[PDB]
Amino acid sequence: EAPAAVVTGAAKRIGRAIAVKLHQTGYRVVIHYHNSAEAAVSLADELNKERSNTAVVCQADLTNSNVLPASCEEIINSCFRAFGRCDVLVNNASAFYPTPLVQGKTVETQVAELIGTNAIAPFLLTMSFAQRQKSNLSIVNLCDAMVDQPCMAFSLYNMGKHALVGLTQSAALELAPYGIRVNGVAPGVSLLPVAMGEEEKDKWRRKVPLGRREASAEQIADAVIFLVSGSAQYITGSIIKVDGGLSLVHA
Amino acid sequence: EAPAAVVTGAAKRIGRAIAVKLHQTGYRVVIHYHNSAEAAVSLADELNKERSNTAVVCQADLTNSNVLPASCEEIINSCFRAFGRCDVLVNNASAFYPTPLVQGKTVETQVAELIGTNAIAPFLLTMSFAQRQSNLSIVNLCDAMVDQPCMAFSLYNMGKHALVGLTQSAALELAPYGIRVNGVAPGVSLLPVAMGEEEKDKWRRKVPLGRREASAEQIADAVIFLVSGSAQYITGSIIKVDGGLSLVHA
Amino acid sequence: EAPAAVVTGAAKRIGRAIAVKLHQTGYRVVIHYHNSAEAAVSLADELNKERSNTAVVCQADLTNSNVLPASCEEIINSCFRAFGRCDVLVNNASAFYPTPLVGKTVETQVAELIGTNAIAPFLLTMSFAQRQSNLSIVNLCDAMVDQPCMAFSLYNMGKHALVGLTQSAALELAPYGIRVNGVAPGVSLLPVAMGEEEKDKWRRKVPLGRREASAEQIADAVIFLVSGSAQYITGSIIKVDGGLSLVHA
Amino acid sequence: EAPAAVVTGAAKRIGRAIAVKLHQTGYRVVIHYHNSAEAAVSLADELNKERSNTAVVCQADLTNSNVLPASCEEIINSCFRAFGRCDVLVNNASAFYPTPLVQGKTVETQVAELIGTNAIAPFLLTMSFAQRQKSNLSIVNLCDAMVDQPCMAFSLYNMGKHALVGLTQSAALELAPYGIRVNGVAPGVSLLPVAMGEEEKDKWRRKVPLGRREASAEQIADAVIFLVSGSAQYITGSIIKVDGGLSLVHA
Ligand SMILES: NC(=O)C1=CN([C@@H]2O[C@H](COP(=O)(O)OP(=O)(O)OC[C@H]3O[C@@H](n4cnc5c(N)ncnc54)[C@H](OP(=O)(O)O)[C@@H]3O)[C@@H](O)[C@H]2O)C=CC1
Ligand SMILES: NC(=O)C1=CN([C@@H]2O[C@H](COP(=O)(O)OP(=O)(O)OC[C@H]3O[C@@H](n4cnc5c(N)ncnc54)[C@H](OP(=O)(O)O)[C@@H]3O)[C@@H](O)[C@H]2O)C=CC1
Ligand SMILES: NC(=O)C1=CN([C@@H]2O[C@H](COP(=O)(O)OP(=O)(O)OC[C@H]3O[C@@H](n4cnc5c(N)ncnc54)[C@H](OP(=O)(O)O)[C@@H]3O)[C@@H](O)[C@H]2O)C=CC1
Numbered sequence A, D: 001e002a003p004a005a006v007v008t009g010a011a012k013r014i015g016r017a018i019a020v021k022l023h024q025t026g027y028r029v030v031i032h033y034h035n036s037a038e039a040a041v042s043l044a045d046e047l048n049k050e051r052s053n054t055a056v057v058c059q060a061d062l063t064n065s066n067v068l069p070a071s072c073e074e075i076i077n078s079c080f081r082a083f084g085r086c087d088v089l090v091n092n093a094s095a096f097y098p099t100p101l102v103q104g105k106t107v108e109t110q111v112a113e114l115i116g117t118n119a120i121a122p123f124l125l126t127m128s129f130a131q132r133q134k135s136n137l138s139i140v141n142l143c144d145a146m147v148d149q150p151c152m153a154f155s156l157y158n159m160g161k162h163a164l165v166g167l168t169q170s171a172a173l174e175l176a177p178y179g180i181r182v183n184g185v186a187p188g189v190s191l192l193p194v195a196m197g198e199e200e201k202d203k204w205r206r207k208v209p210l211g212r213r214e215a216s217a218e219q220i221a222d223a224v225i226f227l228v229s230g231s232a233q234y235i236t237g238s239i240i241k242v243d244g245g246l247s248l249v250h251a
Numbered sequence B: 001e002a003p004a005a006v007v008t009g010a011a012k013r014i015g016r017a018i019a020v021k022l023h024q025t026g027y028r029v030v031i032h033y034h035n036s037a038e039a040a041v042s043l044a045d046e047l048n049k050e051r052s053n054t055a056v057v058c059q060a061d062l063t064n065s066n067v068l069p070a071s072c073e074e075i076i077n078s079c080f081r082a083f084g085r086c087d088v089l090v091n092n093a094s095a096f097y098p099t100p101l102v103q104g105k106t107v108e109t110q111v112a113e114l115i116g117t118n119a120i121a122p123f124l125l126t127m128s129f130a131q132r133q134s135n136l137s138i139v140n141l142c143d144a145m146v147d148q149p150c151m152a153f154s155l156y157n158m159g160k161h162a163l164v165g166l167t168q169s170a171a172l173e174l175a176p177y178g179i180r181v182n183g184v185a186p187g188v189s190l191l192p193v194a195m196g197e198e199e200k201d202k203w204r205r206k207v208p209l210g211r212r213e214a215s216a217e218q219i220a221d222a223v224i225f226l227v228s229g230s231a232q233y234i235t236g237s238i239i240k241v242d243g244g245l246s247l248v249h250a
Numbered sequence C: 001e002a003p004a005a006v007v008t009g010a011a012k013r014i015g016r017a018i019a020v021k022l023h024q025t026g027y028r029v030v031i032h033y034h035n036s037a038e039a040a041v042s043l044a045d046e047l048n049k050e051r052s053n054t055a056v057v058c059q060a061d062l063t064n065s066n067v068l069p070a071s072c073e074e075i076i077n078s079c080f081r082a083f084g085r086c087d088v089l090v091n092n093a094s095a096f097y098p099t100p101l102v103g104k105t106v107e108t109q110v111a112e113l114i115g116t117n118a119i120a121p122f123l124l125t126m127s128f129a130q131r132q133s134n135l136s137i138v139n140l141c142d143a144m145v146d147q148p149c150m151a152f153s154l155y156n157m158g159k160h161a162l163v164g165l166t167q168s169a170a171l172e173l174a175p176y177g178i179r180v181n182g183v184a185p186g187v188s189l190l191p192v193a194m195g196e197e198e199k200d201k202w203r204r205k206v207p208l209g210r211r212e213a214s215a216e217q218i219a220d221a222v223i224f225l226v227s228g229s230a231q232y233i234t235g236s237i238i239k240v241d242g243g244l245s246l247v248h249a
């Protein structure tokens, strides 16, 4: 009866809010994680406590490598294994850190992590998702509203997010004859990085015209839920910016 | 106590579907109209039958002129007179016809109607709305195909691009008042009444998702989302509702 | 046999530099002006001193009104009257001032900001096309229109509209071999009434060299677009902004 | 005192025209190539017969791999070894082929080739170029004007080109303090695929408003020349579309 959603990097933060909101809307959910095993299991527990057999976890590294296609296949397989179907895919998992052009991680590792999580893994997941569907089927990609006014020294990350815009459009066109919609949600400033100091957090928050506040995880989730809902049945290839006006502010 | 909305060009088609959906959501509505007096009054009547005195009509030419500022002030006024508040403005009214560059409205009428309805009136409405001012927002009806325009529709396209500009500029400026400003960009929706059946079929068949134009209710859906509590962080955004049409190459 | 260009608002600043650079390239030029009669005449003088009979002035208000179509037609006529042809149009003239949402009447703001930045370019385009080699139009856009200054909504509306005209006219005039393109400055020559400390604020924002573009730098891009080196380019807008539009809040 | 340029994939077609035109402008050139050895040496020969000691060849696979960073550093090194300097990088080399989302290269190979050539290698070349400069320095990336209205089934290619737009912007921002400009040139339809039949070629030619024909390689090179010239001293982070109005034509 109930549709089933896969959410990547769903253990914490925005991806958790999305998994929660999908669950509250009646979805069964695959909680994908990489390092956050305890959080993922804890979330799956809460959801199962609310409804029996409605949440499973699935562990996978989404770094680019020659086995990434098999890992992605396996994420989609774990949703069919648990729930017998897979209606929604949310590409939320993301690596995010600077990669300066001028000088622990080798550059090969930087490439693999930032391009793999942000772009190639969404692409292989999309292929695996579609191959299983070869109903209200959709994919939502977590993009970035600030990619055209990027932070200094974030070239690879920005390349990955721009690539994900490219995938959003190319997959929307190609999957439309199957009824599969493909769209994006582009946060500006949301939950700030765990490592960022309170003072820097404050600087970022106050750049936002609408209320001088970061978007809550729930606010982002609200846009995701809109895109997968019957209220968006004609929307595909669209990216909804959710940024409180941040991208409109000049230097 | 219920919120109130103005919807321009609300007598028929997309504007009517927005008005109805806002009304169904619990809004009181001003149905603005220009020539479609029977349809406008009839719609308001049906809404009032559903809930007493929850709909008013207001007629106004949104052609650019030295009287346009007052007319736009009067529309916003009408909402405050009827309902004592104005929470939502939907700039939906729009002129749409060819204005070839190389050669019976005079070109100055074409200018006044296409730039007035699509851009200047939204601007003056936005001014009046903001001037009079806890979930306030403006939704501008844009056009997903503005970067791949139909041949000979320069003034129309100029208007819709100006409307994108307005959405962004007004989002920035009005954010300190809590007024969100967003847009909804249809691709092909209800086709022009004038358009021949063959041309209509040529458009719908180009749409990747379903080979069908959007229903008026599908557009209204996105408007509803933008005015809703589910979009409280969204401002300066334009949501394309086009079934993937703008993605299709020549 | 020398081709001819119209440049609107060519008496001073960027338009002056564009008229001068086109002239140095070998064009005969119509120097359009509104209030700057003395400056326009000096320029025509300097240019004709270099090559006899190669520059004329043409006065016109480019405020929106029911006669704007005729004034625009007259600017193109002035090129044909002087030079017997019109090869290039540069839409440069522009009103720029704030128009907050919350002693010019709003209707005057609309007419000046939308007429100069958009409607007059449209009507000049129609007149240019109606008269019709390396034919092209260049529109002076704005690189910052998606991250606009506070309180400039009419100006931004005009500049967005001009992008739309650039694309629509490029599409419609291509079958005539007329190319239509844009040049989008960021910070260039700073507004005459700006204080030095404020100028300096805008300079420090520019990644490439922490300075504004010279007028000549803007003119360089125009020159490119009108040249035989840009023969396949139409519907393009070149940003000339030193990376300003890439800088976040 | 003659400046020097690297052009990738410069043996044939557009990259060849770029190399020729830079040389004609007075640059010394490194002609990078992958498989087209005969064409590359043949071009080096012509250029040298015009001015001695002004053209060399450099062979490298630009496929993504853990060896790609070394290969890229080596290409830039080639220009220092031969010419003592490196003023201009043009990232022209590109793989281009369909990658259906729904089903004889493996998916891993398709990723490596399409994301490597179109994005990763440009990023790594850009690091190596920049590291050396830590005068009129600039990079030109060959983009694609049709990236927002993409051909069916070219997901990875489009991801690659979108990433390359991201690079262009990120790198323009990050390298501006060194005086290095970073810009792009976005052909529409230019030299048609060698493997495309004359009937399909004419189909594409007919779509182009400006003259109903593809751009010549020389027309594309013209734009690169402008961007590298002193006529573009203030231009960085810009992409010039060279497409004859193609991207303006609706479905
Ligand atoms: N937060 C913000 O301000 C903004 C967010 N966004 C986008 O929104 C989305 C959610 O953001 P946010 O919640 O902050 O994301 P996080 O930075 O918290 O990343 C979410 C999850 O991604 C997973 N992940 C990271 N690297 C890998 C990897 N190599 N393989 C597998 N999974 C991996 C992690 O899983 P685990 O912990 O289990 O290892 C992590 O918890 C992202 O796509 C992001 O780029 C865009 C703009 C701003
Ligand atoms: N339909 C579609 O496929 C598409 C629609 N859109 C946009 O969506 C919105 C709604 O579309 P749609 O329902 O088709 O619009 P219509 O063409 O039906 O126009 C809506 C209303 O605008 C009003 N209007 C026209 N001229 C004037 C004027 N001078 N003064 C005042 N009002 C005027 C009319 O009121 P009255 O009838 O009372 O005179 C008309 O009913 C518009 O902004 C449109 O551009 C965008 C892309 C495609
Ligand atoms: N300067 C900058 O930093 C930037 C410039 N731009 C764009 O580049 C172009 C040139 O900028 P800039 O040189 O500073 O321009 P100016 O503000 O100096 O204006 C150029 C000319 O426009 C003419 N003009 C103004 N109003 C009217 C009118 N109603 N009718 C006719 N002509 C009129 C004036 O002519 P007169 O003096 O004869 O009355 C004026 O000299 C403009 O399009 C501008 O928007 C874009 C971004 C930044």
Ligand SMILES: NC(=O)C1=CN([C@@H]2O[C@H](COP(=O)(O)OP(=O)(O)OC[C@H]3O[C@@H](n4cnc5c(N)ncnc54)[C@H](OP(=O)(O)O)[C@@H]3O)[C@@H](O)[C@H]2O)C=CC1
Pocket: D008, D009, D010, D011, D012, D013, D014, D015, D032, D033, D034, D035, D036, D037, D060, D061, D062, D063, D091, D092, D093, D094, D095, D096, D113, D117, D142, D143, D144, D145, D186, D187, D188, D189, D190, D191, D192
């Ligand atoms: N032609 C057109 O119509 C259009 C072109 N463009 C862009 O313009 C640029 C030039 O186009 P075009 O000349 O047609 O390009 P080609 O398709 O002819 O490819 C250029 C060169 O790329 C090199 N290349 C391909 N794969 C690899 C690899 N794995 N490692 C190293 N080098 C490799 C090849 O070198 P070799 O032959 O030595 O093996 C090839 O000759 C490209 O970036 C392209 O995407 C954009 C839009 C349309």
Ligand SMILES: N=C(N)Nc1nc2cc(Cl)c(Cl)cc2[nH]1
Pocket: A093, A094, A095, A096, A144, A146, A188, A189, A190, A192, A193, A204
């Ligand atoms: N945590 C992430 N995966 N992505 C992320 N985190 C981000 C934080 C900010 Cl301040 C911005 Cl402008 C963009 C960001 N993207």
Ligand SMILES: N=C(N)Nc1nc2cc(Cl)c(Cl)cc2[nH]1
Pocket: B093, B094, B095, B096, B143, B145, B187, B188, B189, B191, B192, B203
């Ligand atoms: N009816 C209007 N006012 N606007 C409108 N009507 C439109 C019809 C189409 Cl076929 C497209 Cl492409 C854009 C349109 N915009």
Ligand SMILES: N=C(N)Nc1nc2cc(Cl)c(Cl)cc2[nH]1
Pocket: C093, C094, C095, C096, C142, C144, C186, C187, C188, C190, C191, C202
């Ligand atoms: N003077 C004009 N006509 N236009 C103009 N002048 C401008 C000055 C700035 Cl500092 C920016 Cl950001 C945009 C501008 N546009």
Ligand SMILES: N=C(N)Nc1nc2cc(Cl)c(Cl)cc2[nH]1
Pocket: D093, D094, D095, D096, D144, D146, D188, D189, D190, D192, D193, D204
């Ligand atoms: N050959 C390449 N490497 N790239 C390339 N070749 C192309 C050919 C076309 Cl007719 C299009 Cl619309 C885009 C192209 N991109």
